[PDB]
Structure formats: structure tokens, C-alpha cells
Amino acid sequence: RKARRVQLQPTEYLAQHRMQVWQLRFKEMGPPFSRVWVALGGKMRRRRVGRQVDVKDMRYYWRPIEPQYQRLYMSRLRIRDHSNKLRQPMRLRATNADIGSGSSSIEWERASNRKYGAMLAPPKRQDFEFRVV
Amino acid sequence: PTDVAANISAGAMPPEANVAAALPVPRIQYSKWNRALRSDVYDELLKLPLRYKLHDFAKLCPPQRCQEEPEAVGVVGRDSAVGYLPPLGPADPLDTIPFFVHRSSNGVLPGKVFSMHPRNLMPAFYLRIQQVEGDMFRFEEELLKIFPTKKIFVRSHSIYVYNVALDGRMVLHHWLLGLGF
Amino acid sequence: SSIFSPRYDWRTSGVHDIAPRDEGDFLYQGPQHVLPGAHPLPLHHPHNTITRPVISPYIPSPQRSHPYFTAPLPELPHFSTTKPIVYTYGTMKERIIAPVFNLKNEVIYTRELDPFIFGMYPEVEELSKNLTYWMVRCQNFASKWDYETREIWRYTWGGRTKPSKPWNMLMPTMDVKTWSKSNRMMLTLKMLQGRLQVVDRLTLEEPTQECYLELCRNMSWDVRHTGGGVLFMDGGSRITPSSEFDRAFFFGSFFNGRNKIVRPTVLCDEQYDYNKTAAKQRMKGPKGAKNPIPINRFNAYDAMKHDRLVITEGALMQLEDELYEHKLQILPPHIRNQLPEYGYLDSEALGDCVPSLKTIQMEAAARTEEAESDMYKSFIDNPYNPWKDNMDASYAVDGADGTVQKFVDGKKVSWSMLS
Amino acid sequence: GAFTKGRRPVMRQKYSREALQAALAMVPPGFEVADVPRPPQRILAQSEGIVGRWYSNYWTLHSMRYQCLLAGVEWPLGERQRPRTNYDEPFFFADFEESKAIRDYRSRWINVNRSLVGMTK
Amino acid sequence: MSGAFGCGSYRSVVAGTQNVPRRMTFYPSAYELIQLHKAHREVIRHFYVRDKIFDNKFPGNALANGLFKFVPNRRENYHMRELMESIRRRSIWMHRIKQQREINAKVVENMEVKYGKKAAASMLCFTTPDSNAYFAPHRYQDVANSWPNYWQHPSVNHVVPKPRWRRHRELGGITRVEDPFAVQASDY
Amino acid sequence: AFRRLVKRHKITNNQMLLMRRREPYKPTMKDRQEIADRAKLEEFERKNADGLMFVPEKALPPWQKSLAHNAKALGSRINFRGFRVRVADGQDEPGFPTPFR
Amino acid sequence: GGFTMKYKKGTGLWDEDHVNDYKTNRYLSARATMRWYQEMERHQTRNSLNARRATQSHNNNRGLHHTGRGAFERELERRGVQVEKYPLTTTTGTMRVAELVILRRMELEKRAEEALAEQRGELQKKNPTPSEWYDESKGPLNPNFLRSMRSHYEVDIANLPDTPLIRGQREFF
Amino acid sequence: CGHNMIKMGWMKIGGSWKYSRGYNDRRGQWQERKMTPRFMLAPRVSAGGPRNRYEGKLVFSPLRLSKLLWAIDTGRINPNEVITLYHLRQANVVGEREIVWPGFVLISNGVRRVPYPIHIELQNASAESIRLIEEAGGSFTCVYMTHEGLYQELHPEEYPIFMDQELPERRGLESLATNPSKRGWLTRWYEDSSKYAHPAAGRRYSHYLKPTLLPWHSYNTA
RNA sequence: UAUUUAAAUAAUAUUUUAAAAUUUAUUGAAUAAAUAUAGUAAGAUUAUUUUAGUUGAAUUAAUAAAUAAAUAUUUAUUUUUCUUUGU
Numbered sequence A: 001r002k003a004r005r006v007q008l009q010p011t012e013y014l015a016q017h018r019m020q021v022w023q024l025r026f027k028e029m030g031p032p033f034s035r036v037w038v039a040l041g042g043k044m045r046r047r048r049v050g051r052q053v054d055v056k057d058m059r060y061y062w063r064p065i066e067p068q069y070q071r072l073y074m075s076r077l078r079i080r081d082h083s084n085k086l087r088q089p090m091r092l093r094a095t096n097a098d099i100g101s102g103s104s105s106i107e108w109e110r111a112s113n114r115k116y117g118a119m120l121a122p123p124k125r126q127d128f129e130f131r132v133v
Numbered sequence B: 001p002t003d004v005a006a007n008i009s010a011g012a013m014p015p016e017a018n019v020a021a022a023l024p025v026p027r028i029q030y031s032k033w034n035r036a037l038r039s040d041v042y043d044e045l046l047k048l049p050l051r052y053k054l055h056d057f058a059k060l061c062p063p064q065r066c067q068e069e070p071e072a073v074g075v076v077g078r079d080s081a082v083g084y085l086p087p088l089g090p091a092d093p094l095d096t097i098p099f100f101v102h103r104s105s106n107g108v109l110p111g112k113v114f115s116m117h118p119r120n121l122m123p124a125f126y127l128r129i130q131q132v133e134g135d136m137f138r139f140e141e142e143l144l145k146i147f148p149t150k151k152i153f154v155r156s157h158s159i160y161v162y163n164v165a166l167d168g169r170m171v172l173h174h175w176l177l178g179l180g181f
Numbered sequence C: 001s002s003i004f005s006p007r008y009d010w011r012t013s014g015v016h017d018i019a020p021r022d023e024g025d026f027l028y029q030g031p032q033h034v035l036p037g038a039h040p041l042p043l044h045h046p047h048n049t050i051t052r053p054v055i056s057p058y059i060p061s062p063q064r065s066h067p068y069f070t071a072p073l074p075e076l077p078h079f080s081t082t083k084p085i086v087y088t089y090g091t092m093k094e095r096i097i098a099p100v101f102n103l104k105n106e107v108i109y110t111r112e113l114d115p116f117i118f119g120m121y122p123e124v125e126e127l128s129k130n131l132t133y134w135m136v137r138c139q140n141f142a143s144k145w146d147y148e149t150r151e152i153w154r155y156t157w158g159g160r161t162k163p164s165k166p167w168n169m170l171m172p173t174m175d176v177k178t179w180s181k182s183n184r185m186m187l188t189l190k191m192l193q194g195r196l197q198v199v200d201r202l203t204l205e206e207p208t209q210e211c212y213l214e215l216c217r218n219m220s221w222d223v224r225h226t227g228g229g230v231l232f233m234d235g236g237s238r239i240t241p242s243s244e245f246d247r248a249f250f251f252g253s254f255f256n257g258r259n260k261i262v263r264p265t266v267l268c269d270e271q272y273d274y275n276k277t278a279a280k281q282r283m284k285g286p287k288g289a290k291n292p293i294p295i296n297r298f299n300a301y302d303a304m305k306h307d308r309l310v311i312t313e314g315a316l317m318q319l320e321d322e323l324y325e326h327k328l329q330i331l332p333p334h335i336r337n338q339l340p341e342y343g344y345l346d347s348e349a350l351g352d353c354v355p356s357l358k359t360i361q362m363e364a365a366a367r368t369e370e371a372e373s374d375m376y377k378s379f380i381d382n383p384y385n386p387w388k389d390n391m392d393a394s395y396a397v398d399g400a401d402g403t404v405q406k407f408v409d410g411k412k413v414s415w416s417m418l419s
Numbered sequence D: 001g002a003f004t005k006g007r008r009p010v011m012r013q014k015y016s017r018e019a020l021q022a023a024l025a026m027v028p029p030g031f032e033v034a035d036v037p038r039p040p041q042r043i044l045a046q047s048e049g050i051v052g053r054w055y056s057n058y059w060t061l062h063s064m065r066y067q068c069l070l071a072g073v074e075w076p077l078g079e080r081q082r083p084r085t086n087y088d089e090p091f092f093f094a095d096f097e098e099s100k101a102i103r104d105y106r107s108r109w110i111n112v113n114r115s116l117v118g119m120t121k
Numbered sequence E: 001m002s003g004a005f006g007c008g009s010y011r012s013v014v015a016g017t018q019n020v021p022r023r024m025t026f027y028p029s030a031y032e033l034i035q036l037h038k039a040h041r042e043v044i045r046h047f048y049v050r051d052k053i054f055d056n057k058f059p060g061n062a063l064a065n066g067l068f069k070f071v072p073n074r075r076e077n078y079h080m081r082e083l084m085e086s087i088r089r090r091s092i093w094m095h096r097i098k099q100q101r102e103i104n105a106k107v108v109e110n111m112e113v114k115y116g117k118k119a120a121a122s123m124l125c126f127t128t129p130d131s132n133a134y135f136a137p138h139r140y141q142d143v144a145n146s147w148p149n150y151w152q153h154p155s156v157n158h159v160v161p162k163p164r165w166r167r168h169r170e171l172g173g174i175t176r177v178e179d180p181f182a183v184q185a186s187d188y
Numbered sequence F: 001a002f003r004r005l006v007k008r009h010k011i012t013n014n015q016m017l018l019m020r021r022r023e024p025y026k027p028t029m030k031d032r033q034e035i036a037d038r039a040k041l042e043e044f045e046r047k048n049a050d051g052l053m054f055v056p057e058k059a060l061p062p063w064q065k066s067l068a069h070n071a072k073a074l075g076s077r078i079n080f081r082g083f084r085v086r087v088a089d090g091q092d093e094p095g096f097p098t099p100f101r
Numbered sequence G: 001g002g003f004t005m006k007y008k009k010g011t012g013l014w015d016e017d018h019v020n021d022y023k024t025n026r027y028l029s030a031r032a033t034m035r036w037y038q039e040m041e042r043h044q045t046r047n048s049l050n051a052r053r054a055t056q057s058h059n060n061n062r063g064l065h066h067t068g069r070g071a072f073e074r075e076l077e078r079r080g081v082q083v084e085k086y087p088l089t090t091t092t093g094t095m096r097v098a099e100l101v102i103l104r105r106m107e108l109e110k111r112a113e114e115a116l117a118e119q120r121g122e123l124q125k126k127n128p129t130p131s132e133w134y135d136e137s138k139g140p141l142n143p144n145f146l147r148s149m150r151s152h153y154e155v156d157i158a159n160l161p162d163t164p165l166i167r168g169q170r171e172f173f
Numbered sequence H: 001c002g003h004n005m006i007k008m009g010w011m012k013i014g015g016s017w018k019y020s021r022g023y024n025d026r027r028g029q030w031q032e033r034k035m036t037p038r039f040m041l042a043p044r045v046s047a048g049g050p051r052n053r054y055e056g057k058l059v060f061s062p063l064r065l066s067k068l069l070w071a072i073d074t075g076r077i078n079p080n081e082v083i084t085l086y087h088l089r090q091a092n093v094v095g096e097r098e099i100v101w102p103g104f105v106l107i108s109n110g111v112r113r114v115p116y117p118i119h120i121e122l123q124n125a126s127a128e129s130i131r132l133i134e135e136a137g138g139s140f141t142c143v144y145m146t147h148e149g150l151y152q153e154l155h156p157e158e159y160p161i162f163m164d165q166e167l168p169e170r171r172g173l174e175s176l177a178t179n180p181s182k183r184g185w186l187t188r189w190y191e192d193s194s195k196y197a198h199p200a201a202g203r204r205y206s207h208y209l210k211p212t213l214l215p216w217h218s219y220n221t222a
Numbered sequence I: 001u002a003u004u005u006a007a008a009u010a011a012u013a014u015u016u017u018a019a020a021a022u023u024u025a026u027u028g029a030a031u032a033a034a035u036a037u038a039g040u041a042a043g044a045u046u047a048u049u050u051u052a053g054u055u056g057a058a059u060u061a062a063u064a065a066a067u068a069a070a071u072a073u074u075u076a077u078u079u080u081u082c083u084u085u086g087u
């Protein structure tokens, strides 16, 4: 007769898999077909006062991460739109093309806001009589 | 094909050529927006045996003359930085080319290099030409004569050449320009 | 069964009766015997000229590129194309002239076609794209509903985990480029097969159905279900083209047979999708384009299902006017830089040429604009002359206010935006 | 976005030039645009058109100021803010709310010039 | 702010960029003419959509024939939002094309006063062999083969196997072919 | 026994039944592993036969090229010879004379 | 509810444009086509009339006229002053425009028919014999088209010999 | 028509499901055996991270001078009129997808000489592009616009009368608007020192430099 | 800071039966909801006649060291040699 009917299921976030942890630790570099995820070298460790008195050894250099970890992270990005092999994986950091395509679709051709990086641009100068109860 | 690093190690060249052994010679790269013609590859194409005659590089290159003209006009062939020129046509008028190659809207040549299974970011590339009109098989045979060892397929819409990069797309564009399309 | 299967030929006797019939069965005389239906090429549809009549100057032959004329006949008035002829990447590269017909089954005159519209040589990939999109869109998506385990209340009765749902089903999105390309290729395929007929008008003396049937009988239009169907593209006529259909013929064309009238257009609206991320839960209908193509458009499926294609001269004019800008934009630059030289881009808006022929509705709208243009005179937001005081203005950058303002003769003209 | 007045029109009535002059005729003398303040963000931005006491409505007042600017009708009322360019009378004013001292043209003119001369990059 | 008319915007005006005596180059404005044609078509279409009238041919929905297909409020909003902006875009295109036509006339006069009539006529011509191809292929059949069906080009027309056909009447006016078939291979 | 469903090859000769291993001439797992290791070592020694050649700033890996360029772009504005910026990351010292050096 | 492109709904040239129709079928009979057109027109009219009734009831409940113009606008209309900044063309004007366009089209059709009949008479009295198009060098003619063109000539055309008659090898009639 | 079984290839339906792990996978430890997390091994260079696109970072979209020259030689853009972002978008030399605040950067890639003077208005043009345009004779003007200014430039038809546009932010002013090297559009206003003396004199005017459109006409040929 | 070559703007989903009592209420241990969730125990998962590689390896928590190996899908290098060789 009548029971609990199932409705449409909401989709996940388009940038759900990309992690701020990765965006803070690593960064992507290189040509499009030879991208490498690199993080700064050195050993991070907290020790007592009086250790590593010489600073010349501590170097700020970037070394690439292991290829298996790079493949795992890239696959985490590749999760979205898996069936279309003709679509290149997403990027660790969103680019200008991505921010533009976020609203360049024809379903956003009427909205004046959200266009040309409204959320990215700093706010406008508010009115001088601006006040809230 | 000279190994500058090996020559420097053996003592046949001066040790100041390490930059030459490491980095290639700086040249304006051929692009879809900057037709940087390469005289060496064009001479190689002229030396290669083909049935159709190609125009001279002097006519393929845009003219470079004095720029004292006060106002510019709409000449078909004028000074251009990116090296854009209308199609010159066939080299010998008393001939019939079995195929015709149309350009795109921006005047770019049909050569487009894609990748096989690009989701995995695969380095293996291939070239697709989908603006050839006329006898596609004559164009395919000319591509055979150009790239002997490559796999070249043909369909009603596109001609595919597998295992060729931009380094082959530029050769294809050079041959097309020399032919006159 | 399958060809390479043992179960394919275990029925070794009894399939046929040893005794033949006495009315239809006959013996093979020899090589000089003409068997009914025998043909060397595999023809799943063995229709011939008599059964499926083609209406064209010549029967489509391998010597002729297209079965229609190639040069205007000196004993018939020739009508050039409304818009100038350009040969694009896919055009047949040959002149095409169709013998326009009248409502009395008589050739009136000869009108030249457009190779961009009726010269784009067909291609199986695009035809299949069109056919697949149409056959996947026309299916009813509201009847795909199914039960689920949470919807079944007390296995056989317990529904499946992932059942088919009207919202879960997909409705694809097709771009206007491929749509127009496939429609043009289908029109060219009909032209090549020689089943395209151009009529001046599609008008009935009475809006009833018997007058429609009498017209079809007089001009030998087979409309029966079993016979070859008809696909009309009504657009009015050459002098008075109309986007809408003629009322009398549109009322009379409702016959049980195989005849379908479609809108005189080959393009389509750009399909939008506002539920791409499944934001609105209570939406009912398939995912994808929420603005599908209506049924009364020209399509590969209906074109294949209906034998003859009868296009009107009004439809021809409308198609040419709609595809003019497209076939002009497709051209490469070293070709399109010569259109104003040859006179192809003489726009009547600048006053270069007299306004060209337009449809009834478009002419009405244009006259409405011409009459309403008088009200936009004493206002600064006049659309026909916007910002008519820039070169006589003075821009001042007031830093205390942090704004750039437009003063004229010492008076502020710029308007401060309200929030 | 639909509640407050953000990028959105509030009056959907567009009158002719003669109708604006008739609407501005009912304005009582001694009125000024600086009297009507901007309503807070917790108030709906609606306009009832040209009705009685329409000048009291902040959104209706300035919207009428925008249409006359397009039609070229001389705005009889003043401006929303009167800038103080030169030191004149009164040479001192009284304010118990610390708003007039900040909104002064000269008070913010020196602040912008402070940031302009402060750039040293 | 007049960046649409082709001149410098108010930002350039404030910057004081001297770009007025810049240059006078000939320009065909073909792309601008195409865009003007598109804008004119769009304006006419917007007017036709705004002037829609209910024309119901069925008796059930017959009580609407006199009304507009829009609610007057939405009709006013449409007129102010899209129909009035299409005209502004059309005017922008027309102004740009008129400025370019003025500059073209000046360049034509300069070429006529410098080189000569026929010299200017040849210098301001864009005709190319591929242009002759695109505009008239019959003057290009000899130069190259540009047909989608290359086997029917008159250069390669010899390949089409023209058969000996005949119309038999005993079959009902049916065209058949006279030459015999070829014995196809059957087995190994 | 890592793969637990062995391949069944087409039997062209009856001795393919008696044979167990697919490629008999091919060395076993560990033997071919150490063989490939020795071959890679020999190739690396052939590559490092000559001295470690130093590369300019353009012919550097991406994680060092931009850093080395920005460390000296400040001095690149003033064209004067004899200006070195001792950067941390870069090609390490070989420790012996080199013809490229 | 939610967001839906109401600005796109009602913008197409016909009623069937910009409507989410996912309940149709690949083949529609005569009754199916009539019901489809009926449903589209009825959907459009329902939307329009429901919106109009809603807004008029809201105006009447707020106390304004059914159009939406208040007492000030009514007093201006009494005085005679134009209330609208841009007076849009009305139904009578649009119908008059359509009528005059139809009439001009009919007159042009009559004149074109007269001129075309004159040219037909001229060309028929000039050319009694079929031109070079009546050839069989490339393909066979179509008997249907020949029977249709019969009326334009004096000599019978449908009488076709079994041999592919060519212009050069044999004289025609 | 088959199952893509991991470590086993492509198997037919109804085959051996015994040695199957792709099902459990769809439903490494040997690398994490030593408790070595990659996300905790390397430290963070900053709280925001490398290449953090914060408000005001001024991440421009690349626009190749070679591409611009190609478009001009093609005929999409008219070199007579001043080049602007609106003209670019209308000539369709750049699609709408590449547009994002801040507008563009003029990159001179693969160009060594500009034969004709080009008068273009963009943001944060490279030094080589600026000097090439200056050598050719054209005049570049860096127009760093705010968000509303950029929207008004891209869609001017939505604005019948000029409106008060707010000046850019402090970072934009100190970087591009008031930078003589980048040829900003406020460098002259910033160099003008008379505005600092008196507030009434602070207002600086500027005028255009100097050397209807009704589509219906009359049949004058008769 | 910008002196280096490309590209088919498309997202929606992802086994099944089960391995556990806490939940939210009602009626005097039963009643009705929960595909709620178990690092996830265990099983079942529908389609012959096929056309090419390895059959016990790999195993370095953590500053500048050439490289983990197996299994499987796609995909690439025709150079010499007396024959052979799945890189």
C-alpha cells in the first residue's frame, strides 16, 4: 500500500576528496603530464634548548615525495568523474580556469553575483550610514 | 647528433660548452598562436622524396622589410610577428592535388595532439587531423612517406597518427604549409 | 542459436514440408529467370522505385553527384538562394537546384538550394548520435519507477537495493552544433536518396480531413501506415513565410496514417541543467538537461521512418536565415575577410542595403521596434544612443570619497550606486 | 540578497517626466534628503510607489532621485551628503554622537592622503 | 567608462595616455558585421517574444485569446532587462563599425592620393586562390580536389564503374543491369 | 603461489603437458632480480664514468630552478660581473676535479 | 519549490520551447499529437492565467486596482497625464500590425503571381523542346517527374525507350 | 560484459569467484607497518600553505602576446580601436571561462619584435611586453579594476549612465595602480602633489584628448 | 617574477544476505520505527568452444643516497654481432 518512499540522493562535494592537509604540506609542480608533488626537506623534531646550535645545516630545500604516495593522492583526486577517461584529474590547488568554469556554465549566465570571482575579490566599500539593529 | 657532454669529457670541445651540453639551443617554439618556422626541418622535408612540390621557404616566411611606412593597410601578405600568412596554393599550377586541407576559425592548422587514456596522465600521445577533405587516402599515404615507422589510421572524419608528439605536429604543419594549405 | 554453437543446427528435419504449395511455389528456371527480390547487395529493405516512389529530376546514379539538376533550365524561372552561397568544409562543392512543385502536381519553377544546408555530405557517426539521442530522450521516464526494500512493508516481496528510478535515469544533453550538423546531414541524405520535394504552399481549401486526403490523392502522396510516410516542414510560402503553421493545413493534417508535420527549424535551444548536483530533492524527472527537444522538431529518427520529405519554401528561407551566421562564422579568416568585399555582409542596419525579406512575425516585431523607437528621445538611457556625452565629459578622482566621478560643465552626472 | 537592498531594484514603477513633476509637487517645503537616514539591515527594503508621505521612505526617495536623473528633471531636494571642502561658517559644530566628526569631508581627506604618503614599498 | 566604443576608458583618461594620433589602418570589420547581424536578429526575436499573443485553437483553453502570453509585470521586467539591452549592444556594434568605416574611407583616400587608383585597388584586395575555391569550386576543380566524395571528382571520375543499364517493361518499368556477375570465391 | 589460478595455454605439442614452467630459458625470480640489479648498477656506473657535470639555472629540476632564479633576479637587474648568491639547495660537490667543472 | 529559470520559461518562439517534457513517446498517433499540443497550450494558459489571478487577487486584497496602480496613478489618469514612462504596444496594436503585414504579403503574392505567369507564358512560347537536361548519359530519368513535367511541353515525355537514349547519338522526336 | 577482477584481469560472468578481492576492494598496510604517516612526516611551511589564494593575492590569468598578435593579424580584433577586456571578450579571442578577478596578465611569450603600435589596456603586464609595445610605438595603460568595475567593463549595457566606481584597495594601489614601472592608470594622479595642499584643490579633473545610430534609413537611391 | 612547447568542460554511481545492543516511543517480557551503523566475521554474486611475459620475489620509520617487487589493464623503444634473449 504505502510505506516510506525513497527520494533523490544529494551528491557529495565536488572538492570533498582534496584535503587541506595535502594543500598545506605538499605542492604540485612540473609540466601537465609530469606533475610531481613536492614537500620541503629536512627532519621535523622538537628537542630541548641547547641542541642544533648551528643553523647552517638546517636547509630550506624541496624534495619530491614517494611515487606511491603521489599516486595515492592523485587517485584520491581522480575519484571524481572516474568513468570519463578523457577528463584529466583535478589539481591540488584550484586554478583560474576552475574558478571561472565554476560559473561559466549556462545555468549561471543570469546571476550577476558569483561571476568573475565575486567570492575571490575583496568586498566593496560599505555605505557610511550602514547600521544594524 | 653530437654529444657535447661526452666531447667535453673526452677533451674534444672547450669546457665552456657545458650550458650547451645541458640545455638545448634557445629557439622560439612553434605554437598554435606563433608559427615559428624551422628552416632545418623544412630543408629536411624538401630533401625527402615526395610526389608533390613544396613552395620555397622564402615564400613561406612572411616578408621582413623596412617599416618606414606611415600607415598600414590590408595587404594579404604583411609584416606579422607570429608569422601568419594566407595559403599560397600549389607550387606548380599544372597539377591537381587529390586532397584539400581546411583551416580552423582562428586560421590554425588541423594538427591536434591528444593522449591515449589521459585520465591516468599517460605520456603516450597521438595526433588527430579532422579537417582534411577530398581523398583522405592520398593524405594518409603522404603521411606514410613522412613518418615511415608510425601507425597511421584513417576514417571518414579523422586521420590518426600514433606515437607522435608536438615535434611531429610541427613537421606536419611545415609540410602542409609547403604544399600550400 | 549463435553461429559458432552446437545448438545451431540440431533441427535437421521437419522444418520444411516436402510437398510445396500449388499457388505460390515455383521452380528455378535458370540464369535468365528473374527472381522476385533477388539482389546481390544485402538490402534489408528491398524497396524499389515502384513500391517507394522517388520524386527527383533523375534517379540517383553513381555518375551523378546528386539526383537533382546542376544548371538552371532555360524553360523554367530560376530563383537564386535568399542568402549568398558559401562552400564550407563539408559542402558538396556543386550547384544544387530543386524543381519546386505546386499543389496541382506540376513543376512551377526551379529554386537553388544551399550546399551548407543541403550539401553537407552525411556521416554515420553524426547520424547515429542524433538517432541515439532521440531514441533515449523520447522514452517515458515517469514509468521507470520501481519498489525498494524500505518502500516494501511486510526475498520475493522485498525490493531490490538499487532499483530503477525516474530521477535516477539519465536524460542526455546535446549541443546545438552537433544537433544542427546531424540535421543538415540528414537533409542531405534525403536529397541524395532523391525523396525531397519542395512545394510553394501547404494550404487546404477547408480545414477538414477529407480535403487533406483529396490533396494527397491529387499529388500522389502516400499517407497510409503500410506505405511510405510523409514528413512535412510547413513554413508558409516564398513571398509570405511564417514561423507558425498554416491553420487549415495544421487542422487537416491529423490523419491516422504516417504523416508528421514538424517545425521549420534545424537548430535548437541550449539545454540547461539546474539540478546538476542534485540540490533540489523534490525534483521529479530524469537527471541531465531539463530543457529537452520537443517532438515537432526535425530528427533523424522521424526522417528515417517517413519516406518522403516535403519542405516548404518558407521553411527553406527560415533555415537559410538561421544558418547564415553559422556558415559565416565557420569560415577561416583569410576567407571571411573577403565577405564585405564580395558583398556578403551588407547589413541593412547600417543603411548599406534595403532591408531583406523576413518572416511575418519578425517583420511585425521589427515594425513594432521602429514605431516604439520614438519614446527613447528625451531620456539619458536612450538605447539607440547610449553614453552620448563621454567625449565632452570630465572625470575627477575624488580621493577623500575614493570614487571616480563624471562631471559635465561643472555639474555631477555620475550616479552613486545604492548599496 | 532578496531581503536587503543588495544589487536589487526596489521600485517597479517608472513614471513619465510630467508624472515625476507631479510627484515632486506634494513635497513639503523645508525638506532635505539628509534628514531621511538609511534603514538598518534588519528591515525589509520595500517601496510602496508614489503614495502619501513617500519622501519618508528611504528607498522610494532615492529611487525617485534616480529616475529624474534619467529623465533630466531637476531634483528639487538636496543631496544625501554635503561635503565640506573649505573651512567656512560654522567654524565649530556640536555633536553628542561621534559620527559628524568622522563623516566630515576634511576629516577623511587627510586620512586618505596619510595612506598615500605612507606607501614606501 | 566607454570601453565598448573602442576609445580609451575613463581609467585611461585619468592616466593621461596619449593614444589619439595612434594610427590609421584599413580593416574589413567582417567579424563586427557578423556580430551586428546576430545582434539585429536577437533584437527582432526579443521584440517578437515580448509581443506574443495567446492564439488558442482548442475550445477548452479558448478563454485567453485576447490576453498577452506574459503577465504585464513580467513583460515590463523583460522590456527593461533584455529587450532594452539588446538595442544598446546593437548600437555599440553600429558605432564601432561606423568609426571603422570612416577610418577605411580615410585610408582609401590616402592610398589614392599616394599610389594611384589601380594601385590602391590591388593593395586593398584580399582575393586568394583558396578564396576562389571557397566561393566558386568550378574555377577550382583543376587546381585541387576538395570534394567530400573524391571518387566522383572529374579528375578521379574514371574509377566509377558506369554499368550497362536497361529498363525492362515486363517487370513494370524496372531498371536492371546487363553485365554478368563475378564468380565469388567459396572455399579454400 | 601468489597467483592461485594458473593460466591454461594452448597445447600445440604433447611435451607442453610434461613441462611445468612457461619460459624455461628465462632465469628464475631471484636470479633475474639480482641480474637486473647488476645491470642497473653497471648502467649507473657507465653514466657516472665521467665527472658530475654542472648545469645552468634553466636546466635544473623544477623544485630548484625557480628558487635559484629568484635568489639572483635581484642582482640580475644591475648588469655587473662577479655577483654570486650562495644558495643552499643545488648540485652537491663531487669532491674531485671534473672536466666539466 | 527552489530555483528554476523562470526567465527562460516562456522565452522560446513556440510554446513547446523551454518546458521539462519527459513523458512523451517516440511515436505519436493523431490523437497523441493532438493531446500533446493541447497539453502544451493548456500548460501555458494555466501558468499565465493562474499568475494573473494570483496577482490581481493580491492587488485587490491590498486595496489597489487589479492592474497595480494606486490612487495617485488613478488621479494622474483622471488628469490625463501619461503615467507609464515607456508605453508598450498593446494587443490591438499588435493585431493591427499582424493584419497589415498579412495584407501586404497577400498583395505581393498577387503581383508576383501575375509576373510569374507572364514569364511562364514567355518561356513556354520560347522553348517547345526539352533542353540538355533530358539526357541519359549519367543516369535514368524519373517517370514520376516526367509525368509531372508533361504539362510544360507539347511532345510526350513519359514515352521512354528501353535504350538509354542520349542527346548526341539519336535525335529526340 | 565481463568483470575487471584485480590481479586476475578480465573474467567472464559466472566464472571462478574463488580468488576474488576486487569485490572487497569496492566494498598500504605494509607501508604503514612502521607507523610513518606521510601527512605528518613533512612539516607545514605556513599556516595558509604554499600558493594559498587569499583575497588580494592577485592571481592573474595568462594572456600571451603571441596570441594577441595572432588574433590581430587574423582579424578578430581591430588594432585601430583601443584594446580592452570587453573588446577581447566580444572578439572571442578569450572564452568566458578564463575570466576571473583580477582580469589578465599580458605575457610576452615567444615574441621578440612587434611591427605595429598596439594600444592595449590590461593588468600587470610583464616588463618585456611593456617594453616591446613601447618599442613598437603603442601605448599600454595598466587598468587595475575592482570587482564591480570589472563587471561593468565586461557588461556595460547593464549600465546606461556612468556610476561612481570605488578606487582599488591599498595593495592594488601600491602594486599596480600607482606603479610607474607597470604604467598604472593612477600614477599621474598619485604624482600630482597639488592635491595634498587643500581639500578643495584635491579634486583633479581629466578630459578626453582630441585629434544617429537608428537602423532605419530612407530610400535615397530613387 | 614571468625570454619554455598541449588538450575531446565532463561531475550524479560503486555488489547482495548477514556477524550487536545500545536508540526513539507506545501498551500492560511483547508492540512500531531504525538498508541507522560492526578496523567490518562468514558465504552467494547469473554469460563455453578462448589466442602471447615472469610461479616464492620485494622488506633502509626521519637532512643533499640512481632505483621496492610481484599480479593485472593499456602503452613504447625494428642499430650493428655466430646463433639466441619479455626491456
Ligand SMILES: NC(=O)c1ccc[n+]([C@@H]2O[C@H](COP(=O)([O-])OP(=O)(O)OC[C@H]3O[C@@H](n4cnc5c(N)ncnc54)[C@H](O)[C@@H]3O)[C@@H](O)[C@H]2O)c1
Pocket: A112, C381, C416, C417, C418, C419, D006, D007, D008, D009, D010, D011, D012, D013, D014, D063, D066, D067, D070, G085, H158, H159, H160
Ligand atoms: N549592483 C547594482 O546596483 C546594479 C547591478 C546591475 C545594474 N545596475 C543598474 O544601476 C542603475 C542604478 O542602480 P541603483 O542600485 O542605484 O538603483 P536601482 O536599480 O535599485 O533602482 C533604480 C530605480 O530606477 C528604475 N529604473 C531602472 N532602470 C531604469 C531605466 N532605464 N529607466 C527608468 N527607470 C529605471 C528602477 O526600476 C528603480 O525604480 C540601474 O540602471 C540598474 O539596473 C545596478
Ligand SMILES: [Mg+2]
Pocket: A015, A016, A017, A018, A019, A020
Ligand atoms: Mg578539504
Ligand SMILES: [Mg+2]
Pocket: A067, A068, A069, A070, A071, A072
Ligand atoms: Mg602509488
Ligand SMILES: [Mg+2]
Pocket: none
Ligand atoms: Mg608488467
